[PDB]
Design a protein around this ligand. Structure first.
Ligand code: POV
Ligand code: POV
Ligand code: POV
Ligand code: POV
Ligand code: POV
Ligand code: POV
Ligand code: DU0
Ligand code: DU0
Ligand code: NA
Ligand code: NA
Lengths: 92, 92
């Protein structure tokens, strides 16, 4: 699960924040939102940053249309597969 | 589950957005919000678009009172039936 989290977090930050200098905040930002997604927070108004109802209108830029596809895959893997594998692990 | 998603998404968009011209955004809008509903996002202030606390007051129009009934059925089928069938699948 931790690996799936990073496999999503790193591309998301890289696509949405392409003009960043090196900083330890990068370590926070690749792990922070992907973790809270496991616990029922999809960040609904940040998914499509170029939509009218977006809370991140300044992040709208080239390639940002990729991040909803990434997040859709991420949560499928975490909830539909990995959370329920863990339920099945504990039941058995 | 993907079929249940479309069975909800298409009516929702059609009832709430009746004055749309053909566009590929239609493909996004029939699948987008119904998918994020699977992962704990009910879009609480968009359900009844004619309420005072609604975030979509301009969408208020004829027939829009139908969409809460549709969404109530949709989530019953997805969480109460289909998510727990999948848990039962993995356990067994
Ligand atoms: C069942 C329901 C679905 C039906 C499916 C039919 C598919 C039809 C395909 C339609 C694609 C064309 C639509 C957009 C028109 C082109 C220009 C455009 O507006 O681009 C938009 C983004 O989107 C893109 O740039 C490309 C999107 C391609 C992926 C679409 C899904 C492909 C099928 C599934 C793939 C999964 C794998 C499938 C195989 C397993 C621009 O949007 P923006 O982000 O707001 O950018 C503007 C702002 N900016 C200038 C600052 C950036
Ligand atoms: C292997 C399985 C494959 C699954 C199916 C294939 C995948 C789904 C196919 C979808 C069709 C493709 C949509 C193209 C729309 C183009 C419109 C556009 O301008 O850009 C959009 C595309 O950019 C995005 O970022 C949104 C992409 C949709 C993500 C869907 C994730 C949910 C997965 C669902 C999976 C369940 C599937 C259910 C069963 C079918 C973004 O719009 P915008 O940024 O707001 O642009 C400004 C526009 N405005 C000014 C009007 C606001
Ligand atoms: C246990 C607790 C529940 C008790 C049940 C008792 C039921 C009593 C029934 C009451 C119906 C009458 C109430 C509304 C008065 C009529 C006019 C009105 O205000 O309409 C409102 C909408 O609603 C409708 O237009 C019709 C709603 C009908 C469905 C109600 C549920 C029926 C039972 C269950 C059905 C499920 C299946 C059942 C069988 C299995 C207008 O609201 P709006 O959207 O804000 O529109 C105004 C704005 N606009 C002008 C822009 C549009
Ligand atoms: C098979 C099983 C059947 C289940 C029971 C039957 C179903 C439930 C029956 C409900 C009674 C019917 C309500 C009528 C109210 C009319 C009022 C009105 O003006 O319009 C409203 C009706 O329009 C809507 O869109 C809301 C409809 C309620 C959806 C309920 C979904 C939850 C299901 C629950 C299932 C669990 C049931 C629990 C066990 C009983 C909308 O109001 P508005 O748009 O804000 O209008 C402006 C008003 N304002 C100015 C004041 C803001
Ligand atoms: C493997 C398939 C090969 C690829 C082709 C087939 C894929 C679909 C077809 C084509 C791709 C989508 C084309 C539409 C977008 C082009 C327009 C555009 O500029 O869009 C954006 C950039 O977009 C890019 O720069 C394109 C990046 C593509 C990355 C690869 C896609 C993943 C394919 C994996 C597929 C696996 C499916 C799932 C697994 C089953 C927006 O840029 P802009 O905002 O206009 O720029 C202005 C910037 N300025 C304001 C700063 C000046
Ligand atoms: C099958 C039973 C037969 C149907 C009748 C009995 C059903 C129960 C009750 C009654 C039906 C609803 C009547 C109340 C609303 C009327 C007032 C009105 O205008 O409302 C709206 C429109 O509404 C319509 O145009 C009505 C659409 C009905 C669709 C069918 C209902 C589903 C029945 C399935 C039942 C299955 C139960 C679940 C399964 C167990 C609001 O319009 P407006 O905003 O005022 O318009 C102004 C527009 N302007 C501003 C642009 C000018
Ligand atoms: C298997 C995993 C692959 C991914 C990964 O883990 C292992 O690989 C690690 C490499 C790390 C970076 C290395 C060096 C620096 C330079 C530093 O420069 C100070 C700048 C400023 C501070 O404010 C001075 O004022 C800032 C931090 C940064 C960019 C690291 C960020 C985290 C990264 C990307 C880690 C990431 C989580
Ligand atoms: C089993 C499922 C039943 C439902 C469904 O899948 C299979 O059936 C598909 C038919 C599709 C539409 C066909 C043609 C067009 C015309 C095009 O015209 C360019 C306009 C503009 C673009 O910006 C030019 O500038 C826009 C797209 C649109 C309306 C399609 C939308 C998606 C639809 C509704 C699909 C839907 C998900
Ligand atoms: Na939740
Ligand atoms: Na939640």
């Amino acid at each position: 699960m931790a690996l799936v989290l990073l496999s999503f977090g790193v591309p998301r930050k890289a696509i949405l924040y392409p003009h960043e200098e090196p900083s330890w905040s990068l370590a926070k930002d690749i792990v922070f939102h992907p973790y809270w997604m496991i616990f029922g927070e999809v960040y609904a108004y940040e998914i499509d940053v170029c939509a009218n109802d977006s809370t991140l209108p300044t992040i709208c830029g080239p390639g940002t249309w990729l991040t909803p596809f990434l997040q859709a895959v991420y949560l499928f893997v975490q909830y539909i597969i990995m959370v329920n594998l863990l339920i099945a692990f504990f039941n058995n």
